[PDB]
Structures are given as C-alpha cells and as structure tokens.
Subunit: 333 residues, 3 copies
C-alpha cells in the first residue's frame, strides 16, 4: 500500500517593469522556471501512515554557461509518520509553523506572501525543523488543529540564512467556511546575525494571526503580524544589511472563483519596519494588487498579476517604487 | 485527459583524441552524462490543448566534490497552448527558430550541429522566447508551415550568453519525403557584447536554409547559412573573445537506416569567419565525419563517431587541428 | 519490453555531537537529504538485455540562497549490455570494483563503509570506468563470480578527486549463506597527486578481502584491506593534504533481522595509516558502533546509529575524537 505522486510544473513567466527595473517591486525580464517533486505515503497499518516529500526549483531563465545554477534549490525535503488521531511528526526542510498563519493570504497569481521569507526562522521554508501536527484535537474537536515545531540551529555562512534553536506553534479553528489561526515562534540569533549593523537583540520572534472565509467560490483573508529581530533587510544606500528590530505587517486578499475558470484577485499588503538603526520608521512593502488567473483545467492555467506599488522614491532603505506586471502560462501535473 | 511522459537517458561516453587533446576537435576523456525531463499535454477541449516540457542535463563525468555541478543545466523549460488549426504559442527556454533550419543536419551520432550554439540568439536553445507555430497554413495547405519568434533581451554577466530584443521566423514546405526550409532572425546586441574586442555592430543576424530528403530509409540534408555579429569566437593566442563579424556555414549529411538496426553516417561541415578584427578570414569548423549508430531497439543504442578534422595547425584563432573519435552506449526511456 | 524504475528517498536526518562537533566523528546539525534516480532495463532479445541507471543526491540541509548546491551531485550514471551467460559490460560513473569487497561491511544504519571513499580509484563511486562482470563462471559454476574494471584517467582540478589509468578486478564465491571475495586494483597517480606533500609513489593500489554469512536473519561480515598511495588524508594542524603512503583497514559488522522489523547492528572499524611523511603511524578511523534500524515496511524506516569513537585527542593528523549519534527517518520508493 504505497502511493507516490511524481509532480511538477513548467512556468513561462515574464516580468515588466519600467527601465531597469532595479527600482521596481519585482524586477524585469524572463522569470520562467520549472518545479519537480515527489510526495509519497505508505499505509503501514490501519492506524499508522509514513510519508515523505521532496520538491526542487529549476530556474528556466539562466543560460547554459556559468550562471546555469542561479536560483536552483531544494524547497522541501522531509519525511514523517502519522498515527490515527494522535498526530503527525516529520523532520527535514519544511514550512515554518508561522506560515500556518501566513498561508491564508499567500494566494496571489504570482506575487503576495511578502513576509513569508525563506530561511527566516518560522515564516517560510526552513531547514532542520521537527514539526508535530494535530487534527481536530486528537479526533475530539472537529475543526480545531494545532502544531508545535522545533527548529534546530543552522549556523550558515551568511546572517541572512542562519538561525539558532527555537520553538514555535500554531492553533487554528475552522467552521463551515470560516477559519481563524494564530502562530508564534521564537529562536536565538547566532553571533553572525548579532554582528550585523542592522538589528540588535538575542531572540528573534515572529507572530501572525489570520482570518478567512473560504466557501461559495469566495476567498477573503487577512493576516496581521509582528516580528522582532527577524525580518531581513538591506539598505541599498550604504550597502549594509541585517534584520529589522521590529515590523508590523498586514496583508489582505479577496478573490472570487467563477465556474467558467476565471479567478480575479485584489489584495493589499504593507510591512513597515521600526527602530531600524540609523533610520527610524521605514516601509518595506506597500502595494495594492489586481490580477487574475484563468484555469483551463487542473493542468493548465494562465495569469496576469499587476502590483501597484506605494513605496515612494525617497524610501530610506532604497526599496524600489515602480510598479511590476507579471504574465505567466503554467502547465502542471 | 492529461498525459505526461517522464523521459531520460543515461549515456556512457568516451572521447579519444591524441595527447591533450586541448588541440583537438572534441577533447579527450570521459564525457558520460544523463538527461531527465517531462513533456505533458492536456486536452482542454476538442480544439485546445495545453502543454509544457522541462529537460535537464546532468554531467556524469564530474567528481562528487567541488566540481560536481560543472556543465549541469536546464536545457528546455516552457509551456504553451495549441488551438485547432490556428497554431501553437509557447513561452520560456526553447529552441531558436533558426534551429528550424539547422535541425536538418543536426543528426550525427555524437557531433555535428556545430553552428547551433546555445544562448546565441536564434540558432540554439535560448531563454525568454515566445514562439508561434503554424501547421499546414491554418489547415489550408498540407506541408506548408511557418513560425515567428520573439526574443526578449537577456542581459547576462557574460557577452557570450547575452542578447537584446529580436524577432526571427521560419517557413518550410515538405512533400513526400522532400523538405525545404528558410529561417532568419535579427536582434540588438547588448553593450557588454559591443564592448568585446571581437565583433562590431548594433544588430546580430542569422539565417540559414535547408534541403533534405527523408524517406525510404535514406536521410540526406544540407544547410547553408550566414551570420553577422552573432557567432561567438575566442582567439586562444591573445585570450580575447567576442563574435565573428561574418560567417558562412555549410553542413551536409548523408545517412542510411538498415532494417537490422545499423545507421551509417557521413557528413561534411565548414564554418568560416570573415572580417575578424586583427585576422581577416579564418575557419572555425572544417571537418569530415564518418560514424555509425547501431539501434538494438527504441531503448538501447551504441555508436561510434569519427571526426576527420581539416582545421590546420596554423589556424589564426588557435582552433584545434587533431581528430576525435567518440564511443557511446545509450539507455533511454 | 522496457521496464524503468523511477526511485528515490527523503531522509530526515540529524547528527548530535558535543559542542562543535568539528572535533567529532560525523559532525553536528541537520544532515537531511533526498535521492532521486532511475534504473531501466530493456529485453532486446531472449539473450541480450540493455540497461542504464542514474542517481542523484539532493542535500536538504542547505538554505535557498548561495549555498543551495552544497553537496549535490550525481552518484551513478552508466549504461550497459548483458548477454546470456557471457556477462555484462557497462561504462560511466559507477562503483569501483574494490567496493565488490568493501560492500560486505558497508551495511550500517547511517555510518560505516569508511574506507570506500568517493572518487578514490577503486574503492567507491568513480567516473569513467568500464566494468565487465560474470555470474556463475559463464553459467558453468554456481556461485563463482568475477569482474574486471578499466579506469580511465580523470585529471581533475584537485589531487583528492583525480586518478590516472588503472585496472582492477574481483572474484567472489558464495554458497548457502556464506560468501568470500577478494579485490585488487592499481592505477597511476597524476602529477597533481604526486606534487602533494603527503604521499609518494607512481602507482596507487588498493586491495581488500571479505567474509560473510548472510542467511537465517543473521548478517556477519568482515573486511581486511590495504592501500598504497591511495587513501586520501589531511593534517588539520599544518593544513596539508594528499594520500597515505600505506594503510591497513579492518571492518567488522554483525547484525540480526527480527521478523517484527527491528535490525540491531554492532560494528568495529579501524584504519591506520603508515609512513605518513612527518608523522609515522597514525589512526584514520577507529571506533565501535551500536545502532539499529526499525523497518515499518519496504517504504518506511527509522534508525539510530551511535559511534563510540576511539580516536584519542592527541591524534597526530587532527582527526576528531568525540562520539556522534545520528537519528533518521526515511521514506523511500
Ligand atoms: C524569494 C523571495 C524574493 S520571495 C519572498 C518575499 N517577496 C515576495 O514574496 C514577492 N512576491 C516578490 C518580490 C520580488 C520578486 C518576486 C516575488 C521576499 O523578499 N522573499 C524572498 C525569499 O523568500 O527569500
Ligand atoms: C555545447 C557546445 C560545445 S555544442 C555546440 C558547437 N559544437 C558542437 O556541436 C560540436 N559537435 C562539439 C564540439 C566540442 C565538443 C562537443 C561537441 C559549439 O561550439 N556549441 C557549444 C554550445 O552550444 O555552447
Ligand atoms: C562522503 C564521505 C564523507 S563518506 C566516506 C568516508 N566516511 C564515512 O563513510 C563515514 N561514515 C562518515 C564520516 C563523516 C560524515 C558522514 C559519514 C569518507 O571519508 N568518505 C567521504 C567520501 O566518500 O568522500
């Protein structure tokens, strides 16, 4: 009783921003890529299932010369066990448990999910996490779920990609279309992170909440969160980098799914940093979004996504102000 | 109605050239590699199909240490739609539309296709191309086909791998075994390309024509083409590189397929550069080929390919003069 | 009649060593990874089969930034033919024929097989080998097998990963649970290897013998071997490296497979270098092992592996002394 899904996608994708667009939200140029992965589950007995998943990103916008590997990476690599109503346990490279909140609004055709950074403690995909998850409170309370996650230190060659040990968890409740969730995690920072000119403190923290409605072809969701010493930042001006002492982040999204296959989306996103050494208050992300995806079927879709960027040209970190539209065609299986 | 072919091959491959063979056509040593890819198509309705393909090259001739990734790359990554008799449109990393001509002679057991450079405008695989193709002139003229291709600028870290925007197209006609084709493309060069000591001008151009006969187990084909500011070149002597101001290229191939599985090949290829700054006229490629492939079945083959190199030892760019034989065994699926 | 097995695994894996553990046997931290590969065979006629295999290692313990490719590599890439009772021939990246002996004890849950180095002549996976193998002496003697292997020179950018040409072979005999094997190989060293401060001579050699019993849920095996100018070594102290002039290596392993799925293991391993320039005699590896693997089924397992390291703290090369325990969960297909 083993079942393995070999999956992936090819995505033709182009970003249009004015001129450079090194002063834009998303950049400009070919951004085509493919994904390949497997996910497997084995029925060990009537109450115990084992499972694993690996998922890799192949950029399609590099040449076949020296830059051939730019942006290629494993995204997910983990294995685990799931026992009857007791819960699941898995270990490896997986989603941070704060993403259990941030997923509510990470639903745009192309962009969105701006605060769910990779290799950033609990908010995105990260290496070396053991995660326990529970559905329906041990089978006792329909729609109530929770999880805890143990993050092992990863002392890497860059501050941006490092973390020390930490714990985080999430609780959510869903009932006939509605969902609420909260998530929090904290972890030590490493000395390389502490040595960064931007950001000061011994503990990174991240929390976020989410509300959503997800029924009758409607999707509305909001997330609000804060972080300390956790959101990574650069100042293009002095070329210094590190982490924002604080941030407050909101994301809203509303979307509708027509039966004939079109899926319009509108969204708002803002993330402001505070106490940034040498600057004070500064916006990191601030934009409105309109876009749509058109689904021909489960295997083929196309989409446009337009980012109406509200960052101004005088932003103190050198964050880009110009808009970006992305256009994509997706074959997947 | 989705169908995905997961495909690939393992290729044991060895090159024999005298001594180095840093002064040979193909080099010397282990050249083993594997390929993996998927190609999928989904029947969206009776007149519309979606499709995507990704294809990657894994070298098998690197160690497991620091050089482990040398020559690994995505070859193809694109997705598209094909509507009844109207045509197909796809975007991503795909073959240049000049390759629609150059494919006629790119048929040798191992070598050949010398002017179909990767990441070289329209002649080989390249990133960021939108390609439209038409079969049988909208369903109206059996055997008449055409295509146009829009190439977006790719300003990369090397001149050799860059291009500016351009358009190219191809028309071909096939009738009971015979085929003729022409293809042309032009594109801007980027300032990094223009700053190269070799090659001067604002526009790269490439064109090529092909004739072939391909029936009754016979395969005969010829290509003739020219290029301006498009064929990449190095002078080993001064270690300078860039692009040939002009070239003229011919390739011939003749082959026969025996029913018992052997496929002999003989071929001729010459590409001469002109107006090369500091040199004048110089051969880039000039060789005769004899070789064969033996097909045990659709999944297994073996081959030998011998390149009788006509480049002389006094060639002004430092192009190698010695011969090369390659031997290969191929399992594929 | 083609059959391709697409295979792989996801492995959540963590190493615990004290402090660093840069002075430990195995290190400390997340060591999660995945594997993907295919192996195919095609029935060409009733007596001839073609086959190929490729196998790749994706580390799951890197970030998605610049270090994303650390430790990723192709492990195997080869294709071949197998004719009735005559034998098999294959070429590409494959196991060294000395591994035909060293496999007997390379059976630990996580560690073990310490002398079977990658890209090290005949003892592990290596590029550019043509290998012939024979089963049951041409169909004439049940249980008697042999092989010869031709290794082509690989002059790489590092001494550690290079080899010159060489030949090696192996003979083994198996009868109702017992197995004996011997293997030997020799090859030239390259000038880059010869220029290393550690190791002196023109020929590398490696041999090893093995005994085992493998029936009735018991597994007991021993290997003894020697090497000249072949085992790679570093002195952390002066930061110099190269190859051990001589080594003598023993490995023992005993294991039992319970029907309910547990598989305890105990093992011993020691490898001592001799005539190391500037040092004399020095241990490379010296440890006891206890560990176990628990198999839920063919697709899921878990394991612990504890290495009781006997290298002392005064070891002259700077080889780590501290213990290491590894814990892993494995989903595979
Ligand atoms: C890989 C990321 C650039 S995506 C995420 C976030 N940004 C977005 O999500 C955003 N839609 C975006 C901006 C620019 C180009 C493309 C997409 C950011 O910064 N994180 C990075 C990370 O995870 O390391
Ligand atoms: C990858 C390429 C070396 S192959 C192509 C052309 N050369 C040949 O095709 C030729 N048969 C050949 C010569 C040497 C070794 C192996 C094969 C050339 O130059 N292009 C390069 C490119 O596309 O970047
Ligand atoms: C890839 C290797 C580190 S594994 C092999 C041998 N060591 C072991 O096998 C050992 N169990 C081990 C030690 C440390 C970490 C993990 C495992 C060694 O050294 N060879 C290297 C090679 O092949 O290049």
């Amino acid at each position: 009783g083993n079942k393995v899904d070999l999956y992936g996608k090819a995505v033709g994708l182009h970003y249009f921003s004015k001129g450079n667009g090194e002063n834009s939200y998303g950049g400009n140029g070919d951004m085509t890529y493919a994904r390949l992965g497997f996910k497997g589950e084995t029925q060990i007995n009537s109450d115990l299932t084992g499972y694993g998943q690996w998922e890799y990103n192949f950029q399609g916008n590099n040449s076949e010369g020296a830059d051939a590997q730019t942006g290629n990476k494993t995204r997910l690599a983990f294995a685990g066990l799931k026992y009857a109503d007791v819960g699941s346990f898995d270990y490896g490279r997986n989603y941070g448990v704060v993403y259990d909140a941030l997923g509510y609004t990470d639903m745009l055709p192309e962009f969105g999910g701006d605060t769910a950074y990779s290799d950033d403690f609990f908010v995105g995909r990260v290496g070396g996490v053991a995660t326990y998850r529970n559905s329906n409170f041990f089978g006792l309370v329909d729609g109530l779920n929770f999880a805890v996650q143990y993050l092992g230190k990863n002392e890497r060659d860059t501050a941006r990609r490092s973390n020390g040990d930490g714990v985080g968890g999430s609780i959510s409740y869903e009932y006939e279309g509605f969902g609420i969730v909260g998530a929090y995690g904290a972890a030590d920072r490493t000395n390389l992170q502490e040595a960064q000119p931007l950001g000061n403190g011994k503990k990174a923290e991240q929390w976020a909440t989410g509300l959503k409605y997800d029924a009758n072809n409607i999707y509305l969701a909001a997330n609000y969160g804060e972080t300390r010493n956790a959101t990574p930042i650069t100042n293009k001006f002095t070329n210094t980098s590190g982490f924002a002492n604080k941030t407050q982040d909101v994301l809203l999204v509303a979307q509708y799914q027509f039966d004939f296959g079109l899926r319009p989306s509108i969204a708002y996103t803002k993330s402001k940093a505070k106490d940034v050494e040498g600057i004070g208050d500064v916006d990191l992300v601030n934009y409105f979004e309109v876009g749509a995806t058109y689904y021909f079927n489960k295997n083929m879709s196309t989409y446009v996504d337009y980012i109406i960027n509200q960052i101004d040209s005088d932003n103190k970190l050198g964050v880009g102000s110009d808009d970006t539209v992305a256009v994509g065609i997706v074959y997947q299986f």
